Amino acid sequence: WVQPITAQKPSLTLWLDDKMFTGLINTGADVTIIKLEDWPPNWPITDTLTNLRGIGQSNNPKQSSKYLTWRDKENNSGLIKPFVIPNLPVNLWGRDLLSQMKIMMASP
Amino acid sequence: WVQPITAQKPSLTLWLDDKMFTGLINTGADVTIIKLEDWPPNWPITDTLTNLRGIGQSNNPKQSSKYLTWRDKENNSGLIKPFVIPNLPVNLWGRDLLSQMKIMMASP
């Protein structure tokens, strides 16, 4: 597939394990982040000692306890372990996931 | 040109008016951000009403008073008015710029 970069949010819909999620393609993010409001309550999360840095800093965010199987509409698949954070406006697909989808950036 | 998305920071080097800048390709934001430490002191900046939403924290940036001519290594060009913020580790190329370079994302 091909998706131009425009003023609109570049979006991607995938399954993580058995649930469908929509998120923002964010080449600026090292890691993938799922909104706490979207996180299934029965999916375990765990403490981390890491720090998410950008505009400010979020210390020791929670993270999925288990690796999740991501799957796209073409049945490509792999594994990801997203962080899970409240008060996020959109889920964020980071380069840990995007690198597994073999995405290129190109210009005409 | 073509650049794969990997775990490494996707970077782009270009000119803004007469000065060369290197930055991170950031599809997650529709605006471009230049670090204050890299901003030429003689280039005017102004207060804005924009709020950049961060990781559980919002920063109020300055913005370039003037539009700047961007130019890449292939001599494509256009105009952007980036924001200017301190304490950011890298310059961030947003979709306002990326869309003028007509960058596509593609997968096999």
Binding site: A29, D30, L52, R53 | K9, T50, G54, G94
Partner: peptide, 7 residues
């Protein structure tokens, strides 16, 4: 890790 969705 670094996370750049500001606007």
């Amino acid at each position: 890790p670094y996370v750049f969705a500001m606007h």
